[PDB]
């Protein structure tokens, strides 16, 4: 419920999950990462869309079953004097696999000769500094984009909505929800047993 207190959004569309039904399901393994986008490539943070940006820096996997949250930022980190806080990787040797945080300082080469620290030649720096000013409308504008990942690994659910639980009922064919496992049937006492670790 704290999501809606963060201005009108250019986001909240989701793939593989229902944004309207965010309280009934229960799961675990929640990971969240934060970055910024220019604004003209907001839709580039999506499975199946591959270009230059979000391909050499952070490639979203096809099997991600998650979505992002974002809104316009004209008073948070946009200054008239400029904001040089954020950078991104211009050049990479090959395509970057998903969920790999990489650091690079060495000079990217564009020829057959060796190149590690030589400037003024066809080798170029693989990074550049952002320039954020209000004179750019959509092309150069900071955004409050945060990616959220949902993992459906076989584990007991830990984090979900604060909805209260009801009393146990027996010998009735009803619908049950046990840590996000929706099922229908009649509940009976279990004569079966196993080692108490599952």
């Amino acid at each position: 419920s704290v999501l809606y207190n963060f201005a009108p959004f250019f986001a909240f569309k989701c793939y593989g999950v229902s944004p309207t039904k965010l309280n009934d399901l229960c799961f675990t393994n929640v990971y969240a990462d934060s970055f910024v986008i220019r604004g003209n490539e907001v839709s580039q943070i999506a499975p199946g869309q591959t270009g230059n940006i979000a391909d050499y820096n952070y490639k979203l996997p096809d099997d991600f079953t998650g979505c992002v949250i974002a809104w316009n930022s004209n008073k948070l980190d946009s200054k008239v004097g400029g904001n040089y806080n954020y950078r991104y990787r211009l050049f990479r040797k090959s395509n970057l696999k998903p969920f790999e945080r990489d650091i690079s300082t060495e000079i990217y080469q564009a020829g057959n000769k060796p190149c590690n620290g030589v400037a003024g030649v066809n080798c170029y720096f693989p990074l550049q500094s952002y320039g954020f000013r209000p004179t750019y409308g959509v092309g150069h504008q900071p955004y409050r984009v945060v990616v959220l990942s949902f993992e459906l690994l076989h584990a007991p659910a830990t984090v979900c909505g604060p909805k209260k639980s009801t009393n146990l009922v027996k010998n009735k064919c009803v619908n049950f929800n046990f840590n996000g496992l929706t099922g229908t049937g009649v509940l009976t006492e279990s004569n079966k047993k196993f080692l108490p670790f599952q």
Partner: antibody, heavy 126, light 109 residues
């Protein structure tokens, strides 16, 4: 516009001197500021960078504990102090300032002193 | 530390005077070097930034380019702007900050 610095005159060694850098015109919350000293007969020498909206402090690898600066966002000025002055560390001080705002070490590749502010050359003598 | 720069560089007008700036691999080649000049009793002014572009009000005879481990500056004609000392601005990781030159005293002949 240009920046100012309230320097001092010739002073005895082993004392404390306080200067004040006051902004003028623009709202002093978006420009990263620097400091520099230029010895007579020598070149400029870098000291550090601070931002007058957050608690980020950095120094060079020669004056880590020698200097200590204070920031006042509401008062809208920046002080720094020199303690236990020797005969060689005294130099002319300019309140440097670079365009843009960032607080990372890798950001300094694209950070340069686009504009310069005037200062003063306080000195030391016994 | 400070970079090795020749302080005694001069020449008659009509020819080219070259001033070089020696530095380490982390200072020159992996970082963008800058060129600045200053007057006695006056604030320094920007002449060459990023070694590719020149700002407004700067004469086009100024030139600063990088080609290896040591940058250099070349000037053509010494009439009014090359009678004052210059500086070599660069950034490295030797002190977690920027470096400056020792001053190149250039006179008029």
């Amino acid at each position: 516009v240009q920046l100012v610095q309230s320097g001092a005159e010739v002073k005895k060694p082993g004392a404390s001197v306080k200067v004040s850098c006051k902004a003028s015109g623009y709202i002093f919350s978006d420009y990263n500021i620097h400091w520099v000293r230029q010895a007579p007969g020598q070149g400029l020498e870098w000291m550090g960078w601070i931002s007058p909206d957050s608690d980020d402090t950095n120094y060079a690898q020669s004056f880590q504990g020698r200097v200590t600066m204070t920031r006042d966002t509401s008062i809208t000025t920046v002080y720094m102090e020199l303690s236990s002055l020797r005969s060689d560390d005294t130099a002319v001080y300019f309140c440097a300032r670079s365009v843009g705002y960032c607080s990372l070490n890798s950001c300094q590749r694209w950070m340069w002193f686009d504009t310069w502010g005037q200062g003063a050359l306080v000195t030391v003598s016994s | 530390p400070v970079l090795t720069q020749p302080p005694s560089a001069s020449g008659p007008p009509g020819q080219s005077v070259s001033i070089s700036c020696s530095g380490s691999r982390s200072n020159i080649g992996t970082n963008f070097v800058y060129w600045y000049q200053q007057l006695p009793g006056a604030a320094p002014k920007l002449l060459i930034y990023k070694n590719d572009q020149r700002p407004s009000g700067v004469p086009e005879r100024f030139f600063g380019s990088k080609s290896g481990t040591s940058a250099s500056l070349a000037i053509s004609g010494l009439r009014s702007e090359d009678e004052v000392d210059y500086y070599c601005a660069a950034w490295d990781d030797s002190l977690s900050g920027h470096v400056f030159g020792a001053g190149t005293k250039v006179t008029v002949l």
